[PDB]
Amino acid sequence: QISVRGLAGVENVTELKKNFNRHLHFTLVKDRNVATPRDYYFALAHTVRDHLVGRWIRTQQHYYEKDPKRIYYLSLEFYMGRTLQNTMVNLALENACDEATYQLGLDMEELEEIEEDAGLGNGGLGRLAACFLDSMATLGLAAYGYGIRYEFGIFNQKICGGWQMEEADDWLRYGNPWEKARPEFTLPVHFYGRVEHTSQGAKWVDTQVVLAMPYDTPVPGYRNNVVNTMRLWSAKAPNDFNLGYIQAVLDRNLAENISRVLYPNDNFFEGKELRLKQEYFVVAATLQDIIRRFKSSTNFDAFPDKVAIQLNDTHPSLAIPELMRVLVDLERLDWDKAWEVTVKTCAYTNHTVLPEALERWPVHLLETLLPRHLQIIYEINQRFLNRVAAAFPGDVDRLRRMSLVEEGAVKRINMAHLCIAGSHAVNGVARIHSEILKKTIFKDFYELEPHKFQNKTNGITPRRWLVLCNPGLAEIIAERIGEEYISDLDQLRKLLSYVDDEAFIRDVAKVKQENKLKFAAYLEREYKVHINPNSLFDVQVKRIHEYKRQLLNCLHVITLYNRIKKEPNKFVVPRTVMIGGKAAPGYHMAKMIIKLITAIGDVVNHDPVVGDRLRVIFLENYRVSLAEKVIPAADLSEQISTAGTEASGTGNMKFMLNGALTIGTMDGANVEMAEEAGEENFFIFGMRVEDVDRLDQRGYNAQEYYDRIPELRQIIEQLSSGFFSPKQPDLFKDIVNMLMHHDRFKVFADYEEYVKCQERVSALYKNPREWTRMVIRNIATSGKFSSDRTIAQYAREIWGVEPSRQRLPA
Amino acid sequence: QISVRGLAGVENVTELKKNFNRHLHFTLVKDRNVATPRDYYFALAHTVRDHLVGRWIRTQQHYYEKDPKRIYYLSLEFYMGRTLQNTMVNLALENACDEATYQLGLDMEELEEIEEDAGLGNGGLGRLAACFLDSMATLGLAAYGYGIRYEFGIFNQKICGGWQMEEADDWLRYGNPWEKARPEFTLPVHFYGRVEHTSQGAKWVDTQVVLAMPYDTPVPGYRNNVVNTMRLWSAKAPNDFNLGYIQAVLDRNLAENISRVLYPNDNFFEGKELRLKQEYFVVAATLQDIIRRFKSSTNFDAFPDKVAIQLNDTHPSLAIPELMRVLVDLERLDWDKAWEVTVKTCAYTNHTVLPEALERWPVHLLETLLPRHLQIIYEINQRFLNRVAAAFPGDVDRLRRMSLVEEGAVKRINMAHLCIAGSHAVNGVARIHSEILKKTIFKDFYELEPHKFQNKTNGITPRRWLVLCNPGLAEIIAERIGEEYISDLDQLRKLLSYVDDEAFIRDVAKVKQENKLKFAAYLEREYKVHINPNSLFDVQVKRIHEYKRQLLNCLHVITLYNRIKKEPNKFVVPRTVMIGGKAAPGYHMAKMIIKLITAIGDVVNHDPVVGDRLRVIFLENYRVSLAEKVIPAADLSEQISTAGTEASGTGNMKFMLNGALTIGTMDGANVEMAEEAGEENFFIFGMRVEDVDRLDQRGYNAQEYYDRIPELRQIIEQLSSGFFSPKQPDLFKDIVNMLMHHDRFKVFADYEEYVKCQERVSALYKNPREWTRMVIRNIATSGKFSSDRTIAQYAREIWGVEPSRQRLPA
């Protein structure tokens, strides 16, 4: 039916149906009378996977014969979401499968909804990994994502009594048609042991062995017949393992626990052993695989011309000492040559400046678990500190601050320092974030090695984040400017000359309305809740965190509520305020915030005076596949972190792409978004970075805001006295308390400017034509935030590789 | 090439090749340049599985429409072995796959060897279950095998320093192309809880829930297009399970341990909780499945006309109280009606009379774990004991002996008594065994209910145990009498009129010789050991156990050795003595026996005076697929258990079928084998049942044999003094000791008659023509021991079902 969904040729359709019935009989062992929709999803999934196969074999083939430089993207997280629609989109099968399934009288859209999210990440970081893979494939790069195949992904979020409950995300229960187990490339990983010295050199002995078994997942490029690989390792016990008898066999669990579960903390370090085992496991098995693949081209000098290893934060920072261990202890290169090889191979992306997110591992942990790596780390440190001493003679304090070893009650290794020492490039993830790295957190490193520091502002793939989740907007755009923008997002600027085209204005607004209608129904059906879809859709979707300031949003919500109650008969632009996100299981305050939100919902949604002027909806189980539904439906995107705390953000970009206006602070990539659209086209409010710092110097006193702002004071009194929790009047005492005495994120500082800015949004919503011209100005300048731009920048400025857009043959 | 292997039609062959390349590309994602033999095995396995599918769907279909009475074979063990060749044989594909693979230049026989044994059993009992399935399918019965899909089967056996080491049998490591996961028919199983009483009735509450997820395996009939199902349950935790966070997820192991590992004790009870959980798990999930299938035909009166449940020993005896629980507590039938339903549904096969193999569960165990079932058991007991009292008034002692509850320091439930009480038929497994049940172990039950007691002598399937493992013998038989014998084994009597046919004599002997050559090479290649293949092949293959008397065999071996040393220049028929079998991991004495055997091998195989007159080979890792190789190669079958201890045996039958003569005691099915062949055609020696009993009454004194038999005394002295263990001279003190003071199995009683009988075997081996006429007389009368005979007897005399041989359509 729509043209960006490709051709539905009579041969293709006939062929898809034929194969759909083949898989149902042969793969699924079902006939047409007993098949459930789950079965139909499956037969469709095997039919689409069939189209990937020749392309996958041919791509892996071509890399063997061309032997280009290979990129290894190492991450503990890959937040994939569903695979079926993405695969159709990338192979131009969407319309033909739609047609094929229709003629068997099945509805594709209904089948698509049965597929489980692969939720192997927490939020922005794992999801960036996913976008990056799609972009690497679309840009023809010989790139491999490497991670852990967790048996349980991010937990499923239930609400009970307005509280978060956690359930295990058992995503493999029904099988994963997308992965291919490769038990033939199983590799040993070593743990514990001790180090002996020979005349030969150091030797790591008496280790426990855990096996790493890889699972391969196809990553198709956008219509280029390139299919790359994501390889994910699983832990398996060896068979002599432990080997009274029964118990030995049952104790094989203790080794396979390494890959059992994703750690669910977003932007927060927890120094547990099982986590460090996860990090060593993925690093050890990957390096052997990388090395094996290099030996099928004695000579390690060429290694950096054949291999780039990108580290996704510090989570795989052990790649650096592991690479040293292999080169020094097993390959017998001298120290300096090995070190040159390592530094030229490795690059580090930093994703955060929150000090509680920075990985600092206790020494006693690394000493029991990885005792050779601890030796290598010390040796790295000593040599690094000798370079600091020679460049800054006498600056003793520099030496202490720059050490990889933190002194203190418990000695720690600062993994970020290890990454900077052992990488040729260190990048941040938006311009302002990269500037903060050079000015504060890594100022010392930057003075030593200015040439290492770079910026690579994040992007999102427009395949999933536009073509796939928003076919109607994709189509009306293609109707005006063609299809070429989908792999060249800068082309969206051509849309500026349509900003006064009456028919374009109408089409952008109609697509938004259709998405609102579709999402409003999805609310009704799956969670029995009624929204007015003429209202403005105010959405804040992201992990629950104090720095992200869902609490600021709550204050605005409660204010609107209080204003309606004071003057009940006054006009007010209707809103639906939707806030969604998971809280880490032990982050008590994030759990209270979820509770505050739903408690506000209970008061607000049941007030008859309110009518349908204000609704507050907490969106349960926020995940990739729910982002695909709500983001196209949003009018207002809330990006309201304290200036200097959100490294980049990427939800922000998703919404700019999809026809929402942004109310945000000058934080993270919001700064670049505003500069691409024009500050007039954005709702900028609040402290700048500079303002937060001025506040830190004289001291943040929240009391001052509470005395000066009567509307703020009423809200605190309401929170305090049990307005929102009449059965437990003191339920929110921890929230009030934090806000008044211990708020690291200056929620009151920004309140007054936020409410004013929220009034300007309502004023523009009153004028549909102008709301939409501004929407057009946003969508039109969202080109920069394509992850294709970001990856082409990594490729040229870090990896030394040319992207191409040229199709491999079919 | 050979005619029992079916047709190799030009269309078939072309089609198999086409599909073989299809699966290699599409299923396996490999091309021809990177494929390993494991890959080729796999593509061949998916190609053959494709031929099963339409037949499987059509069979399950036909049972729904015909609605015949359904048989449920409940066993904790199913010893399957490999599936590929069996499937080809049964679908008449063997020659065409052979041809198809040859033209791709691959050797089928080499691919077949990559398949793992499904070793989900310990020995005779699990293997009988497997033969029974093949026979049920071949006889057209609507039959389902139900068990547990263990992640680890019987351990792999390594020898180190002549000792058994155990390794985990990780048979699913590479996937199982034969099973189809059916996560849609997942069923709850309940554990722990407590019982409340309502006005409604008893109610089992506050239980832990474990999920049972079924895996289906096709069981093809012999060329009849019937394909039955073996359904095996896997344990899965529920998702709210336990649900700080990480630990909850990791603790899902404690529920899934239920299906993790097969208990490895053959013919020995170990009362561990995990085992009782295994037994309840398979019973609970199966009964729900049975019941669900019955409700798609209010009325439970018809239930016994629609369902037979056969219990494989007492291992699923909880079926009986579970069936009561469902009917009484959930379906709300009164007690008596429920009881009538249960007794008419259930039948019990006993497989052993060894008192240490009998399941007696501690009460405190059933009370914590299954507290309602314990109530039901008591109620069953009380009512049963009231029937005993009314039939035998005043016989107080009868009441105590017949109780389901054993009094004692620890109260126990005698599960065998529960089975007899709650079944309409109780059968033993050979005639002499069934007679011992009625005369000793269950004399009291038999006086109460004579009509319940039956015999059903075991059989083996001739598809695996002749056509498949011994194509050459199958073929020379088909050359004379046709192919029809393969599903009608009695037809082998026609072979008696060929007992003086010179060409037949030559062919039987040539096939034996070829098998010896083939097996002798397999020894050379896989385990670097040299056998003379002109020697007589004396094999004893079975689990290692004191009652099976591998020790008797050792004594014979050592005697032959001593005789050669006394008169080194005298002629002696050369032998290769091969003994193989696993020992249960904690059965110390069985572990010492393995050690004695290999220690005898070290002395005997290195004596230059011996030459190649005597070799002693311990065959490592005895399993189904090694039985398929050694049994066709055997000349002499050793079946030498003390009279009254081996319930039936089935190895005995395998060898009669395959051209070995038998030296055995009048135990188990040896008695029927001898009577079918004629006692002249068998090497019968030793105490009868009656003789063992005479010995028990005056007392077994092993000293008396040691004083009277000088050849026996020399052997004990050699064992004692370190002849066989010169570095640890006292290594065998436990063996000598047991033999002298604590031998429950009267090894010395039988020694003297055994050695004499072994001399008669050597005398006949000297005359090839007469050895072979006698072999012919055995193979010719082995018809009775077909498991088709056994199953047709179960079907008519217990299940009330007519077998048919009529093909379903193709």
Ligand SMILES: N[C@@H]1[C@@H](O)[C@H](O)[C@@H](CO)O[C@H]1c1nc(-c2ccc3ccccc3c2)n[nH]1
């Ligand atoms: N918060 C940043 C976000 O601004 C940025 O857009 C995105 C991609 O660059 O990454 C986000 C981010 N996630 C994490 C993170 C995620 C999981 C962790 C697990 C353990 C220890 C630290 C951890 C740190 N950092 N930055």
Ligand SMILES: N[C@@H]1[C@@H](O)[C@H](O)[C@@H](CO)O[C@H]1c1nc(-c2ccc3ccccc3c2)n[nH]1
């Ligand atoms: N020993 C008998 C054998 O003579 C007979 O041929 C075969 C089939 O009927 O079954 C053998 C048998 N196995 C067992 C057995 C096997 C596994 C067990 C696990 C736990 C407790 C008892 C157990 C008892 N009994 N009889």
Ligand SMILES: *Cc1c(COP(=O)(O)O)cnc(C)c1O
């Ligand atoms: C894009 C995305 C994120 C990151 O969102 P931010 O607003 O940058 O925190 C987190 N989760 C999901 C499911 C996403 O799609």
Ligand SMILES: *Cc1c(COP(=O)(O)O)cnc(C)c1O
């Ligand atoms: C037939 C068979 C058995 C049973 O053998 P017995 O001699 O009756 O103890 C045990 N194991 C395997 C592998 C078999 O094939």
